[PDB]
Amino acid sequence: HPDISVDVLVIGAGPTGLGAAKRLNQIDGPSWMIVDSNETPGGLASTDVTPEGFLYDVGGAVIFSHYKYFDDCLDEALPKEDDWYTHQRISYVRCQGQWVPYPFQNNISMLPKEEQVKCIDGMIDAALEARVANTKPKTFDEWIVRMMGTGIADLFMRPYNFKVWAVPTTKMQCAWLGERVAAPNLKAVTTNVILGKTAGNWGPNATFRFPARGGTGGIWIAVANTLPKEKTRFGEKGKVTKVNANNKTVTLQDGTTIGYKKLVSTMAVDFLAEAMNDQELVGLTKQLFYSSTHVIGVGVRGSRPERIGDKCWLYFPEDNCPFYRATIFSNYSPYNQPEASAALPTMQLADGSRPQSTEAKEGPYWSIMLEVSESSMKPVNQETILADCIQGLVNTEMLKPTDEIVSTYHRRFDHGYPTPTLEREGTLTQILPKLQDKDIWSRGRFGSWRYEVGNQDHSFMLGVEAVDNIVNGAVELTLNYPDFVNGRQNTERRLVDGAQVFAKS
Amino acid sequence: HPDISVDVLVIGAGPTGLGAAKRLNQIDGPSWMIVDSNETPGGLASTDVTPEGFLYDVAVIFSHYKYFDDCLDEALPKEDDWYTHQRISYVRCQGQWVPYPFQNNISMLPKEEQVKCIDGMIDAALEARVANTKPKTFDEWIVRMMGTGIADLFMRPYNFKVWAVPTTKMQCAWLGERVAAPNLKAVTTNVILGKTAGNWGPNATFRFPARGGTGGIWIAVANTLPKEKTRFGEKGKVTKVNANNKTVTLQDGTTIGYKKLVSTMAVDFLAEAMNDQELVGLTKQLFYSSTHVIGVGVRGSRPERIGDKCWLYFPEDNCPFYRATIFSNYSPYNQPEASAALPTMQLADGSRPQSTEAKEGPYWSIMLEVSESSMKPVNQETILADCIQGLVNTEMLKPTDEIVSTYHRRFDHGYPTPTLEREGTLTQILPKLQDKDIWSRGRFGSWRYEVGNQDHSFMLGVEAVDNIVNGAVELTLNYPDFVNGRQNTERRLVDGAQVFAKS
Amino acid sequence: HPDISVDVLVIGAGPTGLGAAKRLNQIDGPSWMIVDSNETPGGLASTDVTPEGFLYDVAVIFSHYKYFDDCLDEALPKEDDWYTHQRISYVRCQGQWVPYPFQNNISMLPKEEQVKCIDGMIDAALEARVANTKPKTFDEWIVRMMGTGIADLFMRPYNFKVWAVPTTKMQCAWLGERVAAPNLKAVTTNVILGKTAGNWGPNATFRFPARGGTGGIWIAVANTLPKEKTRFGEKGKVTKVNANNKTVTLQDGTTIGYKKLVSTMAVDFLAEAMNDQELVGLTKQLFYSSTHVIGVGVRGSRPERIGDKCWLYFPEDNCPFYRATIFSNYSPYNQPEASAALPTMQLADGSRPQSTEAKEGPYWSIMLEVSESSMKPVNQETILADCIQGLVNTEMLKPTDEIVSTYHRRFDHGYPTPTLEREGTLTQILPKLQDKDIWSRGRFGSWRYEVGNQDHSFMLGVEAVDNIVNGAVELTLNYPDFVNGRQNTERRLVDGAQVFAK
Amino acid sequence: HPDISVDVLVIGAGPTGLGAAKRLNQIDGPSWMIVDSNETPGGLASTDVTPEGFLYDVGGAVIFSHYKYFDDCLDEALPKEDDWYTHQRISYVRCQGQWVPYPFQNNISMLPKEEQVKCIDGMIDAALEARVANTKPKTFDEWIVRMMGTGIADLFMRPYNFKVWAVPTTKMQCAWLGERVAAPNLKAVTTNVILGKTAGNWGPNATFRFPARGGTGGIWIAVANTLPKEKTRFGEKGKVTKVNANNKTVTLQDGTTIGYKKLVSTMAVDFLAEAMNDQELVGLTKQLFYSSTHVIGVGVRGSRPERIGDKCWLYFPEDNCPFYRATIFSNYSPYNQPEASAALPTMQLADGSRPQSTEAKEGPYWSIMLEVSESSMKPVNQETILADCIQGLVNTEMLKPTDEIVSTYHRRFDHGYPTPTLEREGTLTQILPKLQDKDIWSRGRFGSWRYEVGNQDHSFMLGVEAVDNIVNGAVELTLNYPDFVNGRQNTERRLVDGAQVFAKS
Numbered sequence A, D: 001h002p003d004i005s006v007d008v009l010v011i012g013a014g015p016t017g018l019g020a021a022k023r024l025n026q027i028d029g030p031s032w033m034i035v036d037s038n039e040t041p042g043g044l045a046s047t048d049v050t051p052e053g054f055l056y057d058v059g060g061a062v063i064f065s066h067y068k069y070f071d072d073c074l075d076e077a078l079p080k081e082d083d084w085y086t087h088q089r090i091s092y093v094r095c096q097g098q099w100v101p102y103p104f105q106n107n108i109s110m111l112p113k114e115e116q117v118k119c120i121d122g123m124i125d126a127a128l129e130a131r132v133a134n135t136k137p138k139t140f141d142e143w144i145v146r147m148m149g150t151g152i153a154d155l156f157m158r159p160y161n162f163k164v165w166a167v168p169t170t171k172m173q174c175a176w177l178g179e180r181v182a183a184p185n186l187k188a189v190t191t192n193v194i195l196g197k198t199a200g201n202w203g204p205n206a207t208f209r210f211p212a213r214g215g216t217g218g219i220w221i222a223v224a225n226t227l228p229k230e231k232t233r234f235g236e237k238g239k240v241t242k243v244n245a246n247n248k249t250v251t252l253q254d255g256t257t258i259g260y261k262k263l264v265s266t267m268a269v270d271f272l273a274e275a276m277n278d279q280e281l282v283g284l285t286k287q288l289f290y291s292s293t294h295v296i297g298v299g300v301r302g303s304r305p306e307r308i309g310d311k312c313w314l315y316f317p318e319d320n321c322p323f324y325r326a327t328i329f330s331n332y333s334p335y336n337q338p339e340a341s342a343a344l345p346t347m348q349l350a351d352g353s354r355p356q357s358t359e360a361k362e363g364p365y366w367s368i369m370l371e372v373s374e375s376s377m378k379p380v381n382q383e384t385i386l387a388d389c390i391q392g393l394v395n396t397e398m399l400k401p402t403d404e405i406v407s408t409y410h411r412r413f414d415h416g417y418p419t420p421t422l423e424r425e426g427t428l429t430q431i432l433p434k435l436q437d438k439d440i441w442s443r444g445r446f447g448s449w450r451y452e453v454g455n456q457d458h459s460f461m462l463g464v465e466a467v468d469n470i471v472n473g474a475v476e477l478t479l480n481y482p483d484f485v486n487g488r489q490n491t492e493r494r495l496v497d498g499a500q501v502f503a504k505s
Numbered sequence B: 001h002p003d004i005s006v007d008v009l010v011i012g013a014g015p016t017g018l019g020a021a022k023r024l025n026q027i028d029g030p031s032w033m034i035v036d037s038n039e040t041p042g043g044l045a046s047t048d049v050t051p052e053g054f055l056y057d058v059a060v061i062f063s064h065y066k067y068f069d070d071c072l073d074e075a076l077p078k079e080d081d082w083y084t085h086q087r088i089s090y091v092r093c094q095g096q097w098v099p100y101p102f103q104n105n106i107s108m109l110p111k112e113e114q115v116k117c118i119d120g121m122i123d124a125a126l127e128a129r130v131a132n133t134k135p136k137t138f139d140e141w142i143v144r145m146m147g148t149g150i151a152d153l154f155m156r157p158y159n160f161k162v163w164a165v166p167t168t169k170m171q172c173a174w175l176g177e178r179v180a181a182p183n184l185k186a187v188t189t190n191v192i193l194g195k196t197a198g199n200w201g202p203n204a205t206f207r208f209p210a211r212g213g214t215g216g217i218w219i220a221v222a223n224t225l226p227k228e229k230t231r232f233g234e235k236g237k238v239t240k241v242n243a244n245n246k247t248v249t250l251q252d253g254t255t256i257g258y259k260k261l262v263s264t265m266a267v268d269f270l271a272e273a274m275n276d277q278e279l280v281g282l283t284k285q286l287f288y289s290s291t292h293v294i295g296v297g298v299r300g301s302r303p304e305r306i307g308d309k310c311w312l313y314f315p316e317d318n319c320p321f322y323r324a325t326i327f328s329n330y331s332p333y334n335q336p337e338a339s340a341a342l343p344t345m346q347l348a349d350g351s352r353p354q355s356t357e358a359k360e361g362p363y364w365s366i367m368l369e370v371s372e373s374s375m376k377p378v379n380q381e382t383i384l385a386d387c388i389q390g391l392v393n394t395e396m397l398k399p400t401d402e403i404v405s406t407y408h409r410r411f412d413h414g415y416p417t418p419t420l421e422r423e424g425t426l427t428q429i430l431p432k433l434q435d436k437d438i439w440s441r442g443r444f445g446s447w448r449y450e451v452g453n454q455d456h457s458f459m460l461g462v463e464a465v466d467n468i469v470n471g472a473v474e475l476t477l478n479y480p481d482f483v484n485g486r487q488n489t490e491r492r493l494v495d496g497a498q499v500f501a502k503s
Numbered sequence C: 001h002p003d004i005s006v007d008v009l010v011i012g013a014g015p016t017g018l019g020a021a022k023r024l025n026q027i028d029g030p031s032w033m034i035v036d037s038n039e040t041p042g043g044l045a046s047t048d049v050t051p052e053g054f055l056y057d058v059a060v061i062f063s064h065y066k067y068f069d070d071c072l073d074e075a076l077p078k079e080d081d082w083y084t085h086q087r088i089s090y091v092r093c094q095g096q097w098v099p100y101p102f103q104n105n106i107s108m109l110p111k112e113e114q115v116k117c118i119d120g121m122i123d124a125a126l127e128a129r130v131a132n133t134k135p136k137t138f139d140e141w142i143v144r145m146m147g148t149g150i151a152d153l154f155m156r157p158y159n160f161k162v163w164a165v166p167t168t169k170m171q172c173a174w175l176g177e178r179v180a181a182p183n184l185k186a187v188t189t190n191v192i193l194g195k196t197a198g199n200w201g202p203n204a205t206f207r208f209p210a211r212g213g214t215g216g217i218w219i220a221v222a223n224t225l226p227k228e229k230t231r232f233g234e235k236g237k238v239t240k241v242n243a244n245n246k247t248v249t250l251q252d253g254t255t256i257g258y259k260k261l262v263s264t265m266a267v268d269f270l271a272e273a274m275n276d277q278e279l280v281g282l283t284k285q286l287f288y289s290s291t292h293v294i295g296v297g298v299r300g301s302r303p304e305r306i307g308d309k310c311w312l313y314f315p316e317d318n319c320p321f322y323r324a325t326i327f328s329n330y331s332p333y334n335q336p337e338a339s340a341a342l343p344t345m346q347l348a349d350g351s352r353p354q355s356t357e358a359k360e361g362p363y364w365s366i367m368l369e370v371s372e373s374s375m376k377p378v379n380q381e382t383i384l385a386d387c388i389q390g391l392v393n394t395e396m397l398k399p400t401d402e403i404v405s406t407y408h409r410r411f412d413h414g415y416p417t418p419t420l421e422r423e424g425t426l427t428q429i430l431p432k433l434q435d436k437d438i439w440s441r442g443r444f445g446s447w448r449y450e451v452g453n454q455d456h457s458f459m460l461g462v463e464a465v466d467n468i469v470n471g472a473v474e475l476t477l478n479y480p481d482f483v484n485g486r487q488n489t490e491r492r493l494v495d496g497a498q499v500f501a502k
């Protein structure tokens, strides 16, 4: 007999695992517990803070939801109106000295007239071929060309996507992108060129809310707090080291054994295969591809510059900077950085020089958060990436050479993006059903490795729906039908369902 | 305070309501009851029997859901509760029994027609190569799939006889998301090879209850319910629905309070019982056909010309029925034993039998369907005789065949019609009922034919309860293509909830 | 026996008949003569002159044939017999002079219209990508080339004003074999770049006679013929054609016997002169428009707003003419020299001049065309004033401009219409004439507009003779696309036959 | 001064040169003469006769005409009704032991059913692709696949055309084929499959006439006889050895020099370049391609076998025989072979063995004429080709092993077909204008090298039109617009034109 026995064991307390725990806690039938190796729940949605008081999320995380269930849990976790700030998505692409409104491919009107010709010509070619197309594109690259033409592919989509994914567009599938990549309408794009108009409203994150305090990680701390503490085991005491799938036993770092009837595993599936000592699965998971993410944070002295304005996040296809995205993180909340009266010395100027004095001066302060991708196809010099990012900020005119930097941050996250390679689905259909036959629900950004359902709301619901499948026979819609859940308002499942209403009578 | 109070009230014990009841009974959380005005559960999936002992259903099953299978296996668990058959169907066309699907078997038609059919399908294939719109009417869908020549021979005249409306007046989304395009190579190849081939075989089968017909399933399913939570018969006839008070009043005066209502009666009747004039006007804008079911019991061994045929399609105008079923092929117990003695009522040509004496069998049995609507009236007094003449005209019966039993019943609400206007009307009705905590679901509860056969209907009830209790998506109601194109294996009659509770 | 007998008789001394005569005179084998009821050769390519000294043609030459060039160079051999100009043309649209071709220059229009035009051309380009039929009407051809928006702005309303029938009633084979499809990229590129570009330049030119207008060519060409083989004037008016006896009767009673007839008169007149009621019935089923030519002589140096413009198109309804020609740009001698004194007849707004004194020039000159048909009547008594008002409306003239000369003439047979029914009717007429050894050829001799300008017409006559004498294919008559798509260099005014004979 | 001076010199008295001569003689203006190195005019349209009395043409030459002028000249030369025999074209493709009516691609209905499926499937694919085609095919092969589908390409068109052209279909252009290769209508071909019907009437040679005596060569002897004898120079006395294009002088083998003003050269253009000692022209003509043709003749004892019947010519795509075509030459005229009373010994049996008797026996006789192609891409064993053909006749069941052969014939024609290679036009537009600038009209099957206007009537009219261009400024329509002249009735030019009618008064 093992030390602990539960019906459902949840590994991981990021959004996916916390979703599973919330649904298990709501249903309150089968016994359960949740474990994580970090004392602070949140996974890749956690928030760091520099010694100078600048918060940085793991990547430009904004909250936007396809599911009422997710909303219920965030509102339960952070119920006050001043727990949240709402913002319009202000997003731009840096191109040839200009800020081009997102989506690029729908704002060709902003480029020089000569580039407009190249872009529209390519889009005419794509539209004529699309009129007689009877096949689907097989690669991300073919999709880009078929729906945008070469001109826009060469100017933006191809170089940008290598900088994000750390693989070329030719190496990725294209089924994942229904909700991420705008395919442009020839008439709408040409009309806006003729009229000199913009169109910034495309996509599901065109409006968002951001927590007032604690960054994204504050959400998941607050969510986890609603759980019965005795059903949680966070820290080294909850680090999983062995998974014995045949005995349905998990061994923790401190030697605690947990027997389960059903396992919801949200750790990276390649880690799970190793913890299972299952060489067949290790070999299979090693056929998946992922990129690492470097997050760089730069805290700057001064009131928010006019050139920055209300910008939220920014795309950088060009090779004059290492990062693919910048976030004006100080626009998301005033509490992402110190108050104006906080006194801080200048660590360096944006041009790399040292300040003359160690004098601590007051603010106000603003803050830039940058992301750089790394993979076996795209190495990154870890020792210089911070300075290269700051120089990239000067190259893109986001910082003046004289700007005073008062705080820096750099962290590398090994599993950053699960890559939608051409091979992903073929490998996953060998991995996930084999785990399924052992009553292991491997779910999450790296639990099930599908980026298109790898956001905080999708991840949360992957855990929710996994539990719903275990307990109530529910379809795991998010796991297997991203287009289906992304194309509808998912209103049916609530934090208080009929089951709980009728039981309380 | 009302006489009875339950969390969830289910009106109707046809497949839809029994699905709702089966899921409520499985969940065993909220209180509930199910009512029906008929003492026998089954609704429009019941089975009648003539005084001579021939059964007639109002039905072939194909299940898209493990949950449905679980409930049927629970109700009828023994292997000899069922007979399995291949899905053998033919189209009657110009003196020929053409295997279904029609287009793969035009080699049986005269060569001049094969030319016209292939030429039309070539046109459709070339058009499909440059098509960039979806078809808007059932008729356009037919033509794009088949071409003019093949369309005119079968699907156009047959579907008028089925729906009692012309194909140009029906929508086509209810048929699925598949692109309307011909398989030209498959059709020409069979013409070139001079072959026929039906879409059945050892893989393509159905099973049918050994006894009691289709209605036997639903009796057996209903028997698994706690009898005290059921109220079937005149004592369970609903006469008033007060949506504002969440009260139902029965014919005997009993009032039932509910928190959520699952109504499987026809939504136009529901609107009337609600005394909701707005919904009455809206529901009267829906369209439906009535169905005449005709049953004919025949003396004799099964003729060779009938053989293993199961159901048959009739596009041509030499018979009033659109479909015939060799119902005696579904079970030996759909008709009397060979030793049962019965007199001949008439010969197939209408003449009197030579003798009035009762003679022995064996017997076989034909079930026919005729549609009726304001665009296609039916003479109730002569339709039986017209059907029998149609059996002679189609060579299903010889003039000398001995008829030993007849059956004719008219069902007022027979098919909910997928008109062009259906969805515009339903999207005004269903949300107004939903805002009153009324789940109106089923063949005429929600009026969508494509989810109105037995397995879909049952699951409409199951998923309605699952939505009420567990927040499930009602996938069958709103996404028929989605559920039909996948393996619906997740939901079971024993879910994890019940497993974990039992230990 | 008739009064005169020749192997080949030519009726008409416009370009077509003069082509026949030139080839006959070059071959110098079979006997021949040419007649015309006018004392001056040239037909509908003649030139009138107003009493005030302004020339107006009945204009611009593009030659597909070296043979035609040889004859023009023989007739007018000096370099100063001709002036060369670029082919500068514009479409008047919504207050703008839009360079031809219209669709490459819509950037001059309001942005909302550019959107409508480009959207329509996108629709047309996508339909052209899956097209598998040919257009059946001129209208369908226009829409497939241009899209709805651009069609509605120029080619649809303009061609009604030209042909006096709607575009839906005309065939479109007469335009050539080129596929009816848009150049979407070219049109969008000029919109994106905000550019204009006309289809002219240093090598897209035409030449025009220095003196005597277009009519000077045909006088000079006819002068190279042996005078005794010509019969021009009332003495050459044909009044009867007896196709069975192969006899022509002239107005003065002279009878001419022929073995082969090249008739360049209008085929409906020919059927009447033949007293062939069947052919009268068939020819009366052909359709044609009448043409009013209006000329306006203006005092002053050429205004900057006019500039180097040559001819102009008018789709809009603020003027009755479909075409205007800056005829004073074609030659300085199309109008009086600057020292010529002329009184002002009226101002462009219709008012009277302050003085009736004759004042000096210089002068410039506008030539206008208005169409007329049973589907589009024209008031003969007011059309001149309507044209002048149209010149004000289109800003070609300011209200104050001084008009010193006017000209108005109506030509009953102006354009032979490429209706849908034309070919069905012609293929019954021409073979019936051919069986009687009558080659009916020319703008109205054979009624095909696309080979009815000067070089095609001339070559219709040349090729008819070459067919009569040498068994040549009449390529221009039956294969316009063929002759228009090649350099027709083989036939020369001096062929091997004449070289070897000398 | 040269020995002779004429305005127009014609080299060659095949159909092309005789056309030039006939038009020059009709016009009767410029002085002229015609030379040929063979005493018998006719060129590649000549007729040989074996010692046993069997006539064989060069190829399966049959007369079918696009021009009234050509008809006028044939009717003048052979004016009596019994100078000619008229025949329906009975033509078949030997395919898998069966005779499939020509054209093959329109008679799919005759093949085994499994092959009909493959053929119709291929045409369906082609028809759907053709529905969205917006480019023209560039090679003969691409044309075949586009208009016929793979099944018919792989079954017939690809192997037969290699067997004829001695180059693969991928190496040929496709502008030449309008009147040679039937493009199948999908509906017509499918309809005939369904109905079990045939459609053997396609093409300009569905009917033909053949001279009663002397074979095809009898025509050209008779046409040449209408010329004034003193303006002809046929034989070794008329062999051209040097052409001095700069002096406009031709030197004959016997040393005679002829001065000309215009040259109509109908010898092979590569021979002309060699005779000109113009190395530039030699190099260009060597870039042209041609195949050689072997004509094999077999005289057979017996009344015409039932299996042969009224067949005229036959196609052999398969590898059980070396010839691509067989002609039942004895069906063209009874005077192509000896009368029945002629006594001839059996030379061999068709199986190669010696006859039982050497004694001369009577007829009747019939006669087979075979064609085998040769090129640098398709070598041929010259020494065994006669025996290989006879064995192929047995293999194809045209001869029984016991059939008695009474006469054999084999002749190789070095210049047999001018190949429509992809490079042909690019080379010709360098050759023909360069010769044109020297007043040399190089015209004919190998004079101008265009197979699509390489038949007897096209060749004749090339000579006629060259003269008409030299004298009357006529367009050389046949040379430059094969589709134009092949698609119309060329009725305008006659042997008696208006010029001559008016002159005779």
Ligand SMILES: O=c1ccn([C@@H]2O[C@H](COP(=O)(O)OP(=O)(O)O)[C@@H](O)[C@H]2O)c(=O)[nH]1
Residues within 6 Å of the ligand: D093, D102, D103, D104, D105, D157, D161, D164, D180, D181, D182, D315
């Ligand atoms: O059944 C057939 C037989 C021939 N050909 C084509 O017709 C062309 C001309 O062949 P033909 O026998 O008519 O003339 P020849 O080879 O003697 O010049 C050939 O190259 C073939 O590709 C064809 O398409 N289908």
Ligand SMILES: OC[C@@H](O)[C@@H](O)CO
Residues within 6 Å of the ligand: C434, C467, C473, C474, C478, D492
């Ligand atoms: O000789 C008459 C001939 O050229 C015309 O009929 C062509 O149409």
